[PDB]
Amino acid sequence: HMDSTTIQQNKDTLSQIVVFPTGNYDKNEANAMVNRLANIDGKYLNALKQNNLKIKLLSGKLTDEKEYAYLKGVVPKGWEGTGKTWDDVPGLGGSTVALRIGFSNKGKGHDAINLELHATAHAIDHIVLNDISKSAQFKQIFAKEGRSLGNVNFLGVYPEEFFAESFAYYYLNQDTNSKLKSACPQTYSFLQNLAK
């Protein structure tokens, strides 16, 4: 099991994959985002580094970055009916991770319990776990437990989003971990076995 030494090792690993902005920005909040990511099991973080994943922390909009300019004005998958486009999205995950500094908490342009953990969970799912959220086993769990964490007409509709949000509950803090264990016991056991 993880302990404070593992977390310090995780902070070192994250310092090697996180890309910070230059100039003025909320530097302490960016570092606080890293410290929340350091609670993720080190096995996942090590694998992200081995796969040369970069976690970009941004001081502006995602589409202000050169590599995401192509998404300007594009409606993200799953955002139909929001009235919004990628210009408004505070974080993305998958093959890359890009996150607006300061927008971590639920309601800051998104409804994840925590922006960076949800987005990094997607990257782990896709890059490290070969899209395990789409596996027959996780889909079976998702069908039963996917509506137990609120936002039921979004988390309960997309298995990849329920996976990422459950992962964020598991690792954000002790209260969200305990809440997940009570609300989604099969998902909790699934995530616990994954980190063995």
């Binding site: 799953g78 998958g94 994840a112 949800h118 896709h126 988390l155 990849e160 989003e161 990422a164």
Partner: peptide
């Protein structure tokens, strides 16, 4: 793979 945060 590209996925936005939950709306």
């Amino acid at each position: 793979s590209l996925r936005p945060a939950p709306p």
